[PDB]
């Protein structure tokens with residue numbers, strides 16, 4: 578039973594219970610995201626949503642074991658346990674920055690993680706208009722390990738894991754990897770933190786899908802780290818799983834479909850992000866508080882939506898989609914330039 582209501586700030590929302598999230602919004606925009614930025618804390622918050630949510634397994638439950646609660650705030654509640662798992666490396670820092678907000682505002686940890694993830698995305702130009710539903714009860718048990726994918730897992734292992742967790746198919750796997758468009762890597766190369774996956778880590782766009790399809794020619798920092806392969810630009814990192822998903826015959830044409838197609842990118846990610854945040858939950862038992870999330874902003878300027886970074890042309894693309902040739906994009910002018918690092922807070 579939802580009660581449409583006008584909050585104290587004058588805005589109308591779907592249920593009166595949503596109004597209290599406007600105070601949470603104001604607090605995290607100022608004190609967690611430094612004035613609404615799509616910087617390191619926003620990226621970490623988006624990563625935390627996946628690591629809290631994908632830890633659920635119908636297959637383990639069928640074996641008599643607890644397979645995890647899905648989107649239940651378990652990675653925050655039992656952080657001493659889940660953040661020690663190898664796939665969750667580096668997440669205790671963002672969990673520690675978020676905890677005080679959960680305590681101050683009296684919301685569940687699962688609902689806060691889903692909220693901060695959606696607000697973080699709304700700070701990145703180009704993001705979809707994000708949803709936010711409430712209702713996740715506090716987890717009562719930590720998830721098991723072995724449920725969050727690693728960059729060195731094969732494509733078959735990853736496809737099978739997301740299919741078990743939420744009945745997601747191989748095309749939906751590609752949809753959710755769009756989040757690597759606003760993201761950096763702090764713990765794979767031990768000599769440098771903050772290496773972005775694409776040349777625009779503050780913009781939700783398809784440069785991740787363009788740049789992962791170019792030929793990898795060098796390591797940005799040290800060579801041969803586990804789960805890392807060569808990348809095409811100085812300062813950019815590329816992980817093994819993204820590299821192989823982009824070239825596998827099952828997923829390569831879906832990976833290429835986002836290039837120069839902003840509306841598909843936004844619509845597909847909007848859809849799959851909402852689905853991840855409902856894992857382990859009953860959708861009809863949740864409350865829609867999407868009207869609290871800020872409107873996303875357009876990408877500023879007048880460059881084409883997708884482009885080759887300076888120094889790269891169609892000859893540097895490793896075409897993997899047999900149905901449709903990679904689109905001929907324009908190249909930015911000038912010499913190749915390094916992607917700038919995104920320094921993380923201490924402890925990342």
Ligand code: HEM
Nearest residue numbers: 620623624627667726727728753756760761762763764765
């Ligand atoms: C399906 C398989 C995936 C694998 C193997 C994977 C792998 C990784 C790795 C290795 C990192 C760097 C972690 C670190 O250095 O501590 C990373 C970062 C990131 N991942 Fe994924 N990822 C996956 C899917 C996703 C999904 C579905 C999302 C959606 C939210 C996501 C969002 C992020 C974000 C936003 C970052 C950047 C973190 C930051 O800047 O601090 N990833 N991913």
Ligand SMILES: [Ca+2]
Nearest residue numbers: 629647649651
């Ligand atoms: Ca969880």
Ligand SMILES: [Ca+2]
Nearest residue numbers: 758777780782
């Ligand atoms: Ca980007």
